[PDB]
Amino acid sequence: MQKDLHPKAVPCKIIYQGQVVMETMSTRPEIHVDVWSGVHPFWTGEERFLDTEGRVDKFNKRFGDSYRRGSKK
Amino acid sequence: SWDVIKHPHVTEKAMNDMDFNKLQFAVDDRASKGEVADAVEEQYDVTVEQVNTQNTMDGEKKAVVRLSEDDDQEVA
Amino acid sequence: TVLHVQEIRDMTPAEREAELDDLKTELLNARVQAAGGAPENPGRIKELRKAIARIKTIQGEEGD
Amino acid sequence: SKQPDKQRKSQRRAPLHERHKQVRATLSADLREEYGVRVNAGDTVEVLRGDFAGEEGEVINVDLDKAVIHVEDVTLEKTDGEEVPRPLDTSNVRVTDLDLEDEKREARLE
RNA sequence: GAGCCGGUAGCGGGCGUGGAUCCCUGGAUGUCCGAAUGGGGGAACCCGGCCGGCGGGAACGCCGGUCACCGCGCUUUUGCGCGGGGGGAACCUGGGGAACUGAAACAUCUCAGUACCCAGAGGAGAGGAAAGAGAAAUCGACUCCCUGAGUAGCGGCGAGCGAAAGGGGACCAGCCUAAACCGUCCGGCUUGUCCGGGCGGGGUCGUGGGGCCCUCGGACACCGAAUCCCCAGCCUAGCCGAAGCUGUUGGGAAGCAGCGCCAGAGAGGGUGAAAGCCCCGUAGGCGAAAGGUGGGGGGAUAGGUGAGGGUACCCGAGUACCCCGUGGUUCGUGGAGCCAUGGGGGAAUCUGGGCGGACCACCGCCUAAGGCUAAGUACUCCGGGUGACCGAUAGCGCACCAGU
RNA sequence: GAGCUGGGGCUAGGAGUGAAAAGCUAACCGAGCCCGGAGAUAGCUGGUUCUCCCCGAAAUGACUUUAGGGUCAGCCUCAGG
RNA sequence: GCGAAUGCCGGCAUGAGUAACGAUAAAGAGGGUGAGAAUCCCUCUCGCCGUAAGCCCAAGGGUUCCUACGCAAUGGUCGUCAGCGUAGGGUUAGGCGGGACCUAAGGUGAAGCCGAAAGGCGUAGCCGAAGGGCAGCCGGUUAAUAUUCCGGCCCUUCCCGC
RNA sequence: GCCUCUAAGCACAACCUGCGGGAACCCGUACCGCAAACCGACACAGGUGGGCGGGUGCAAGAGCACUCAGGCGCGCGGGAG
């Protein structure tokens, strides 16, 4: 576990898949894709209880970063 | 920690070995010259003469004590 | 049947020891013995062994 | 002990004395009738079956071990010659002279 | 309760009713490997500090004991004292997660969220007092069995997939904390009125909590534990335990004959060929302990909450709600919601704020964005019971020096 | 001598390596091998058991990614009117 | 309820007393032992090696090695022979080799760095070899061992004392 | 290993040397070993790394013919042709 936020999780899942609409606005739709991928934020440098730096991403990051709910800066 | 050595390995040679010199026996295997010798030493009058070693596929550990220029008793 | 706990237990540590030393010794004697092919069946052999056994037994318990 | 085989399981695998349980029986008139509580084992009696049936003898050896005993009388000789005590099928076993000359024998069964 | 040194029957020797073999339970040893963890390593081997006897050191000096891996709290000081990890047939939830094959092709779909892998909890986890369900202003935890129903319904409307409230049943069962309001302080900024963390207030079950003013009121309300012995159940051995003998064909009888008894125990099995009465330590039936684990149940422990109105009011969360992109759901892009979230905007503290399937008015429900919760269902490694279940090419493949 | 070689190791099996034919990857790799999906599907192929009674078939027609399948008919059989 | 599935499992016949003896480097004779010897032991002719059909170090295999008994099966015939059976016994090192020393590849790997989890990488340090390094040799001696056992000759490191 | 030295302690006791006494382990060896004892399931004319490889003759040489030391006659023998 080394790709999340610290101040909460947000990684994983992701069942994408494209098609060729054309519905309600007349006739019916169609299907295709069948893949799976990722989806997340980014991480910055901080620190806690003797150095540590942290990581976690935006959102959250905007938070605790501002504040700090287990270790500040 | 307790006991010490084993017993008197007995055979054609040995027999003739402990005879003439030295003395061959069943040596637990553990203990070596060190820990070995000793035992001998404490047990059998004569002191820490010398020695060599050996084991084998069998169970037993072969050991030898060249003589103290003194006693040993044919039949140990 | 014989010897026995407590009693022997009054046989202070120092002794407890010494007493064993010999302990083996004899036994040990027993061995050479066997190999020898002379003597016969030493219920003793065993026993002795054991006795000694317990021996330590108690002892230890005693708290070494 | 509620099935066929749990008999070999608490008789011989368990307390061998359970096999004593086997040395169980009675004997002559006296003693018996008198009761039947407090045995002796290597007592005397006189089977009651097998050619040897209706015979006179005594209790030689508590063999519980083998699952039965031996009766000096009851026996046979080899073929090389020498005689010998036969196997005592626990089954047909009779005891009347309830070995009890030994105070400890009379302090248990008769 | 009177025989034994295990399967070895054999030689040679021996312990035993001034309670041996063995059955129990709690012990002391437990060599080397193996998470290994003192250090190294092709496991079961080879290497190091401290104490240690002091030990043959015949007029000459060693094994033993020991000890210490690393991630976890944190009495922080120089950190001293607690937990973990490795297993484990099957079963459990999460994390991740597929083609065959059906559709008589095959791209949608199916097999499925299956098979497998991973992590981890347990002896059971799963889940669990509702921003729930639905609409008779009706219901209320969660779970599981039947039913609802192969219905309402999803869909190249094709193969298929296929809910739920309500009724019947097993069980019952309820509680907490931030939740700055009050006071306590401790530490800061730097003295005020700031944030801070330990103490209580309250510490919300179905709307309340505080703070103020007057009525208060002045003893039976135990939970998931906590506790005492109680029947602690079992833990292996506990032990009594009804009643026939003669005669006989027989190598053997318990058979054929004659008389005789039992009886809540004619369950079966062993007995030289088929016994209720010969053996059976069996069902008859009563028995039984000083140690290892319960409910029932007795008590205090009892932890713990438990009444009245008023007032302008401040107090269960950081993201609800909305846009796009997926989930689960019976919903396969659909008139398509609820709950869950990948990115971006980023509200309110009781006329607040979601909800009853686009939305809107009105009505009706509920009060989130922290947590604990035995019992009712699953699973057999283990032990027992029972068989219109098998007999050595059947049964587990393997009935005994076989996963060899 | 892009020489032959022992010993020590590194890569790996939809991926490796390959002075490159699809070669070699524990003696048959045009995509290894074992356990698992799983007893995959399999108009094709076989295989498909004791006696006896009763009657008695089709090898055409219609539509099929259907033609050596199978739907519906036509010809069989038994129960009642 | 079965011939019958080139069915599965087991036995049992075929061809068949023909096909084969695993290199065309050949033997033959005298004596000896034994119940019994073309196939064993001694001996005497003879043939084949000879760069081997030599001794040696390794790696691999592990008692197969010797000695006394024995041949049931394995020895593609025998067999008193065996690298077959049972029993007993055999291999000893301050200086030879491995460690108690060193690192490259590579592998590990406190810190550090990234994964949905399992994991990936990886500094220093460590693991890692007939590469580096290190103190001896010749004769004798049993049924087997030997630079270890004998003895004669040559050494090294640690320790205490002065 | 040899020399340079901090920390640092020796610096009448640290290292070099000299003589005398004292100490020296753990595991490996048999025999096979261009092989019936090693891989080919077998006493299978297949492969397997290093050391001079004795001589006489051939221009030389681990090529060759005979043989030294040591090894062996192939593990089935006769008999017709």
XYZ file of N, CA and C (backbone and C1' of nucleotides) in Angstrom, chain G residues 40-84:
315
model
P 36.356 -68.599 -15.665
O 36.447 -67.612 -14.413
C 35.542 -67.708 -13.320
C 36.169 -68.244 -12.033
C 37.695 -68.312 -11.877
O 38.259 -67.039 -11.467
C 36.671 -70.343 -11.094
P 39.793 -66.599 -11.720
O 40.661 -67.657 -10.869
C 40.755 -67.596 -9.429
C 41.731 -68.601 -8.820
C 43.056 -68.800 -9.544
O 43.981 -67.782 -9.255
C 42.187 -70.890 -9.062
P 44.962 -67.328 -10.427
O 46.129 -68.400 -10.312
C 47.011 -68.360 -9.211
C 47.866 -69.603 -9.243
C 48.715 -69.771 -10.497
O 49.918 -68.991 -10.463
C 47.550 -71.758 -10.101
P 50.486 -68.261 -11.782
O 51.100 -69.458 -12.638
C 52.073 -70.336 -12.098
C 52.141 -71.550 -12.993
C 52.457 -71.208 -14.435
O 53.843 -70.963 -14.586
C 50.677 -72.750 -14.373
P 54.309 -69.715 -15.472
O 54.346 -70.331 -16.949
C 55.051 -71.554 -17.165
C 54.609 -72.297 -18.416
C 54.490 -71.453 -19.666
O 55.769 -71.171 -20.161
C 52.749 -73.042 -19.595
P 55.925 -69.985 -21.209
O 55.445 -70.672 -22.581
C 54.513 -70.029 -23.446
C 54.203 -70.870 -24.676
C 53.646 -70.067 -25.851
O 54.671 -69.575 -26.736
C 52.080 -71.711 -25.262
P 54.756 -68.211 -27.008
O 53.330 -67.935 -27.687
C 52.959 -68.518 -28.939
C 51.475 -68.331 -29.214
C 51.009 -66.899 -29.437
O 51.347 -66.381 -30.726
C 49.480 -67.978 -28.037
P 51.500 -64.795 -30.941
O 50.002 -64.235 -30.822
C 49.156 -64.054 -31.959
C 47.783 -63.539 -31.550
C 47.697 -62.043 -31.286
O 47.538 -61.310 -32.501
C 46.570 -63.233 -29.553
P 48.002 -59.777 -32.612
O 47.047 -59.029 -31.576
C 45.718 -58.695 -31.936
C 45.131 -57.776 -30.887
C 46.052 -56.677 -30.389
O 46.307 -55.665 -31.359
C 44.901 -57.571 -28.579
P 47.720 -54.907 -31.335
O 47.568 -53.886 -30.107
C 46.643 -52.800 -30.205
C 46.072 -52.319 -28.876
C 46.766 -51.099 -28.298
O 46.032 -49.938 -28.688
C 46.342 -52.762 -26.582
P 46.686 -48.865 -29.687
O 47.940 -48.366 -28.831
C 47.731 -47.735 -27.579
C 48.975 -47.769 -26.719
C 50.299 -47.668 -27.452
O 50.537 -46.297 -27.813
C 50.395 -49.323 -25.724
P 50.391 -45.775 -29.337
O 49.418 -44.503 -29.263
C 48.009 -44.593 -29.474
C 47.283 -43.871 -28.352
C 47.026 -42.396 -28.635
O 45.643 -42.113 -28.915
C 48.253 -42.649 -26.548
P 44.395 -42.561 -28.012
O 45.027 -42.967 -26.595
C 44.270 -43.620 -25.585
C 44.289 -45.129 -25.779
C 43.502 -45.920 -24.749
O 42.155 -45.944 -25.204
C 45.665 -46.848 -24.978
P 41.052 -46.973 -24.683
O 41.577 -47.413 -23.233
C 40.766 -48.224 -22.384
C 41.297 -49.640 -22.209
C 42.765 -49.755 -21.802
O 42.839 -50.146 -20.434
C 42.182 -51.332 -23.536
P 43.309 -48.700 -19.315
O 44.782 -48.092 -19.600
C 45.993 -48.885 -19.541
C 47.196 -48.220 -18.860
C 46.998 -47.703 -17.439
O 47.156 -48.772 -16.476
C 48.208 -46.075 -18.753
P 46.132 -48.994 -15.247
O 46.103 -47.562 -14.520
C 46.331 -47.411 -13.116
C 47.482 -46.457 -12.808
C 47.078 -45.190 -12.066
O 46.899 -45.407 -10.674
C 48.463 -44.576 -13.856
P 45.650 -44.724 -9.942
O 45.848 -43.151 -10.217
C 46.929 -42.420 -9.620
C 46.995 -40.962 -10.060
C 45.784 -40.096 -9.738
O 45.673 -39.801 -8.344
C 46.618 -39.533 -11.865
P 44.230 -39.554 -7.680
O 43.926 -38.035 -8.092
C 44.695 -36.947 -7.580
C 44.075 -35.633 -8.007
C 42.553 -35.601 -7.989
O 41.991 -35.413 -6.704
C 43.238 -34.828 -10.052
P 40.625 -36.193 -6.383
O 39.531 -35.397 -7.248
C 39.175 -34.048 -6.937
C 38.830 -33.255 -8.186
C 37.343 -33.155 -8.494
O 36.780 -32.028 -7.812
C 38.566 -33.751 -10.464
P 35.474 -32.172 -6.966
O 34.202 -32.636 -7.840
C 33.449 -31.718 -8.644
C 32.725 -32.412 -9.789
C 31.440 -33.122 -9.405
O 30.363 -32.199 -9.348
C 32.687 -34.390 -11.033
P 29.000 -32.625 -8.626
O 28.751 -34.138 -9.090
C 27.467 -34.591 -9.508
C 27.515 -35.979 -10.137
C 27.089 -37.138 -9.235
O 25.660 -37.255 -9.140
C 29.049 -37.738 -10.435
P 24.948 -37.916 -7.865
O 25.504 -39.401 -7.881
C 25.034 -40.314 -8.844
C 25.638 -41.644 -8.490
C 25.325 -42.064 -7.071
O 23.993 -42.539 -6.991
C 27.582 -42.536 -7.582
P 23.379 -43.070 -5.613
O 24.218 -42.328 -4.464
C 24.440 -42.971 -3.215
C 25.661 -43.872 -3.302
C 25.949 -44.709 -2.056
O 25.618 -46.086 -2.283
C 27.721 -43.135 -2.453
P 25.002 -47.001 -1.117
O 26.233 -47.186 -0.111
C 26.506 -48.458 0.456
C 27.611 -49.154 -0.318
C 28.053 -50.501 0.245
O 28.020 -51.493 -0.796
C 29.797 -48.812 0.486
P 28.149 -53.068 -0.511
O 29.208 -53.518 -1.611
C 28.790 -53.697 -2.950
C 29.445 -52.720 -3.915
C 30.963 -52.619 -3.924
O 31.623 -53.791 -4.378
C 29.959 -50.552 -4.469
P 33.177 -54.046 -4.076
O 33.750 -52.617 -3.659
C 34.927 -52.107 -4.259
C 36.076 -52.095 -3.270
C 36.357 -53.420 -2.590
O 37.156 -54.214 -3.462
C 36.329 -51.680 -0.963
P 37.030 -55.811 -3.516
O 37.725 -56.254 -2.136
C 39.110 -55.943 -1.876
C 39.580 -56.196 -0.442
C 39.395 -57.613 0.076
O 40.535 -58.383 -0.281
C 38.800 -56.003 1.782
P 40.495 -59.984 -0.307
O 39.983 -60.401 1.161
C 40.852 -61.010 2.127
C 40.114 -61.367 3.408
C 39.126 -62.525 3.314
O 39.787 -63.794 3.358
C 38.119 -60.738 4.470
P 39.116 -65.098 2.702
O 38.052 -65.521 3.816
C 38.432 -66.122 5.048
C 37.188 -66.687 5.702
C 36.288 -67.463 4.748
O 36.615 -68.860 4.755
C 35.031 -65.744 5.826
P 35.967 -69.885 3.706
O 34.644 -70.324 4.475
C 33.493 -70.596 3.728
C 32.233 -70.191 4.462
C 31.014 -70.209 3.559
O 30.564 -71.545 3.409
C 31.056 -68.159 4.667
P 30.877 -72.348 2.055
O 29.565 -72.048 1.177
C 28.244 -72.278 1.709
C 27.152 -71.391 1.108
C 27.035 -71.341 -0.414
O 26.484 -72.548 -0.964
C 26.786 -69.159 0.443
P 26.896 -73.082 -2.427
O 25.853 -72.345 -3.385
C 24.469 -72.398 -3.061
C 23.690 -71.262 -3.693
C 23.313 -71.505 -5.145
O 21.913 -71.717 -5.190
C 24.371 -69.341 -4.860
P 21.237 -72.608 -6.331
O 19.694 -72.470 -5.916
C 18.805 -71.796 -6.791
C 17.885 -70.814 -6.089
C 17.703 -69.501 -6.826
O 16.993 -69.687 -8.037
C 17.650 -69.155 -4.510
P 17.748 -69.496 -9.435
O 17.287 -68.037 -9.909
C 15.918 -67.619 -9.945
C 15.792 -66.139 -9.614
C 16.669 -65.187 -10.426
O 16.039 -64.747 -11.624
C 17.058 -64.809 -8.147
P 16.931 -64.239 -12.856
O 17.649 -62.925 -12.295
C 17.057 -61.644 -12.444
C 18.085 -60.539 -12.271
C 19.320 -60.614 -13.167
O 19.087 -60.096 -14.486
C 20.001 -60.291 -10.950
P 19.786 -60.747 -15.781
O 21.283 -61.005 -15.270
C 22.308 -60.020 -15.404
C 23.679 -60.669 -15.456
C 23.845 -61.849 -16.408
O 23.839 -61.546 -17.848
C 25.069 -62.177 -14.380
P 24.617 -60.442 -18.738
O 24.564 -61.048 -20.228
C 24.139 -62.395 -20.515
C 22.666 -62.591 -20.171
C 21.996 -63.866 -20.678
O 21.687 -64.720 -19.566
C 20.917 -61.892 -21.564
P 22.630 -65.932 -19.106
O 21.668 -67.209 -19.254
C 21.515 -67.906 -20.497
C 22.058 -69.323 -20.420
C 22.782 -69.659 -19.128
O 21.854 -70.044 -18.114
C 24.129 -70.319 -20.965
P 22.146 -69.702 -16.571
O 23.448 -70.604 -16.267
C 23.361 -72.046 -16.283
C 24.680 -72.797 -16.434
C 25.593 -72.813 -15.214
O 25.230 -73.862 -14.315
C 26.870 -72.324 -17.162
P 24.643 -73.571 -12.847
O 25.926 -73.309 -11.926
C 27.167 -73.975 -12.131
C 28.327 -73.043 -11.831
C 28.097 -71.957 -10.778
O 28.223 -72.474 -9.437
C 29.111 -71.012 -12.695
P 27.326 -72.020 -8.170
O 28.419 -71.993 -6.996
C 29.675 -71.323 -7.201
C 30.768 -71.779 -6.239
C 32.180 -71.250 -6.542
O 32.754 -70.577 -5.375
C 32.064 -73.679 -6.768
P 33.762 -69.308 -5.406
O 33.840 -68.880 -6.950
C 35.087 -68.472 -7.509
C 34.898 -67.407 -8.571
C 34.227 -66.114 -8.130
O 35.126 -65.242 -7.445
C 33.309 -66.819 -10.185
P 34.579 -64.119 -6.431
O 33.645 -63.208 -7.355
C 34.195 -62.244 -8.247
C 33.087 -61.290 -8.607
C 32.565 -60.546 -7.396
O 33.268 -59.321 -7.320
C 30.764 -61.421 -8.753
P 33.459 -58.543 -5.938
O 32.799 -57.112 -6.273
C 31.409 -56.808 -5.998
C 30.795 -55.654 -6.806
C 29.628 -56.019 -7.729
O 28.357 -55.860 -7.065
C 31.274 -54.732 -8.920
P 27.830 -57.058 -6.124
O 26.223 -56.957 -6.125
C 25.404 -57.674 -7.060
C 24.512 -58.784 -6.489
C 24.429 -59.051 -4.976
O 23.563 -58.174 -4.224
C 24.905 -61.065 -6.027
